[PDB]
Design a protein around this ligand. Structure first.
Ligand code: HEB
Ligand code: NA
Length: 88
């Protein structure tokens, strides 16, 4: 159901920050407002779907579930909620 960005921080820290804290190899850096603005406009459904499925965009490779197949979709989406909430 509804996103839990606070619970999402645990997943973000363990599984996502490794690329997104500094923005390595094209990953949009958490807190980078210009990088995130058009991504946020896609809405959460699309952000979370692309995060669970993986994709390659103009910046680099976003691996499915951050590369950790042991994550649930709920955990991944909660981590996205955390990232978006910190990037406005
Ligand atoms: C290896 C490294 C890495 C990692 C680990 C990650 C991990 C992650 N991630 Fe990432 N990403 C990335 C890399 C990455 N990543 C990149 C590079 C990108 C960009 C792509 C393009 O091009 O755009 C992204 C992107 C991204 C996004 C955006 C989308 C759109 O715009 O549509 C999101 C939301 C995310 C989330 C995430 C999460 C939640 C996680 C954990 C689970 N990602
Ligand atoms: Na929607």
């Amino acid at each position: 159901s509804t996103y839990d960005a606070a619970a999402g921080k645990a997943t973000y820290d363990a599984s996502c920050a490794t690329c997104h804290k500094t923005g390595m190899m094209g990953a949009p850096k958490v807190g980078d407002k210009a990088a995130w603005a058009p991504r946020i406009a896609q809405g959460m459904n699309t952000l979370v779907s692309k995060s669970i499925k993986g994709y390659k965009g103009t910046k680099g490779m976003m691996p499915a579930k951050g590369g950790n197949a042991k994550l649930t979709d709920a955990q991944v989406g909660n981590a996205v909620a955390y990232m978006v909430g910190q990037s406005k």
